[PDB]
Amino acid sequence: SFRGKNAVVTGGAGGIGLQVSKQLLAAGAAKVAIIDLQDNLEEFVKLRAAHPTQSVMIIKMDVANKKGVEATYEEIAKTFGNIDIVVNVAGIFNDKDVQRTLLVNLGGIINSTLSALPYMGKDNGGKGGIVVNMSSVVGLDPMFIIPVYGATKAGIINFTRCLANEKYYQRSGIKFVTVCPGATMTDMFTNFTEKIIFPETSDETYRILDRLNKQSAADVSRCILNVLEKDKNGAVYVIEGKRVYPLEIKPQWTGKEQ
């Protein structure tokens, strides 16, 4: 299934990304590299032990750091020698810090995606592969409480769909997929109300926070592995209530000129 495959996962020390890393290994992935800010060291020790015939590599790196990411990917390629799968999950919610939100959520995805390509492409010696970028349902349909976060999520979609063009695919053999999950119980929502732009919308946060138990990080991760098996270039998937929904995206309809 994913046996013999080499994978990289940003945000792979926690939440959804952690479950992606775990499940990839449990699905028989040869090698798994984790790029994250947080150490979670005790957790990775036991993970190595549970997969003694599989490589588990952790690099502490901020995905916002372009050169850092570039360097990190270099280190991975020395060890791995090839990359088949990239899952870019890293992201934060903090609408009070615009610059950080933009650079992490949108720049991180881009930095990681672009840094991986030379080690994956059929041109430059690779065998091709797949990149899955973490967007959100709110990137598809704006959610008024969280405009800055949402903007970064919409950007990820546009970015990822672009790279899936036939022009690139024929040359690189790399596929590009976006996933858009709904509310999911993770540390991203810790102190959520403290981090929203408009304090007078604190009484509307229930709209998100009451739905967190409707799917888990593990559930979302299972849907992601499902998305990987489909291996369909340019696809966009919604992940809601533990299920995967393929989107057929149609261009916007235009009214008569005013």
Ligand X SMILES: NC(=O)c1ccc[n+]([C@@H]2O[C@H](COP(=O)([O-])OP(=O)(O)OC[C@H]3O[C@@H](n4cnc5c(N)ncnc54)[C@H](O)[C@@H]3O)[C@@H](O)[C@H]2O)c1
Asked if 12 touches Mg ion (CB under 5 A), the answer is no
Asked if 224 touches ligand X (CB under 6 A), the answer is no
Residue 101 to residue 8: CA distance in whole angstroms? 22
**Cβ 196 vs Cβ 153: under 8 Å:** no
The nearest distance, CB 227 to its own copies, in angstroms, is 9
- CB burial class (10 A; 0-12, 13-18, 19+) of residue 181? buried
The nearest distance, CB 21 to its own copies, in angstroms, is 23
Question: Residues with Cβ < 8 Å from 118, sequence gap 6 or more?
Answer: 124, 126
Matching residue, tokens 């088949």:
84
Tokens of 60: 């502490």
Binding mask 69-98 for Mg ion (x = CB under 5 A): -----------------------x------
Residue 226's H or E segment, with its range, is: helix 217-230
**Binding range to ligand X, per CB under 6 A, among 46-54, 180-188, 193-201, 247-255:** 180-188
**Residue 232 backbone phi and psi in degrees, to 5:** -105, 115
List the single partner that 63 binds among ligand X, its own copies, Mg ion, none, CB under 5 to 8 Å by kind.
ligand X
Spell 119-147 as b/e; 16+ CB within 10 A means b.
bbbeeeebeebbbbbbbbbbbbeebebbe
Asked if 104 touches ligand X (CB under 6 A), the answer is yes
Catalytic, 149? Answer: yes
Which residues of the shown chain bind Mg ion in the complex (CB under 5 A)?
A: 14-15, 92, 186-188
Which residues of the shown chain bind its own copies in the complex (CB under 8 A)?
A: 66, 98-99, 102-103, 106-107, 110-111, 114, 137-148, 150-159, 161-165, 167-168, 171, 180, 197-198, 200-201, 204, 226, 230, 238, 240, 243-258
Mind telling me the catalytic residues? 149
Which residues of the shown chain bind ligand X in the complex (CB under 6 A)?
A: 11, 13-17, 36-38, 62-64, 89-92, 104-105, 108, 134, 136, 181, 183-184, 186-188, 217
